[PDB]
Symmetry: C2
């Protein structure tokens, strides 16, 4: 089973967590999920038909996050990390009645 | 955010991890996901119309794992716990392009 990447950062550091695009069946069911410690995971940001390529969960109010979305990349960036960014982030694609996660990162301080 | 139930168990013990049928839109879309430490989560067992009511992921063979499924319950059972059962378990329903997790357990030793 795919091991998570572990990323150790300090307060105020810039970070990118990676997810490859090369093997996505339906770009449209691709998304990053986020799990804070001790909590259930939640849809965070999805691939999206737009100029940016992506759309955060409704009512996510934090412009530190962005993504790099192209033919090859679906990478999540943070400019200026803070303690509450810590947690696990899983990249996955919904396929039928199931989702398959193809990468993830445990971001820690 | 929903809190995971934190459960600490002893080797050999029995454990049930609860998930409700009460607000499910489509049962066919309901599944438990399993996450080993430092791994991506993986689909583990889904609702399935049958005498048992469920079907484990292809490749999984461990008869200590079962489910209690009825009109109210979609509960995951372990009979005779083992340390490699350690990890996080999430119950979610795919809803269109996105899975929504409704409950989970942090199973510890």
């Amino acid at each position: 089973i795919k091991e998570l990447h572990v990323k150790t950062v300090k307060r105020g550091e810039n970070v990118t967590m990676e997810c490859s695009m090369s093997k996505v069946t339906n770009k449209d069911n691709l998304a990053w999920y986020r799990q804070s410690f001790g909590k259930v995971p939640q849809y965070f940001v999805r691939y999206y038909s737009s100029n940016s390529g992506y759309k955060f969960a409704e009512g996510f109010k934090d412009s530190r996050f962005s993504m790099t979305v192209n033919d090859q990349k679906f990478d999540l960036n943070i400019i200026g990390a803070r303690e509450d960014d810590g947690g696990e982030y899983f990249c996955g694609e919904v396929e039928g009645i199931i989702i398959k996660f193809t990468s993830g990162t445990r971001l820690q301080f």
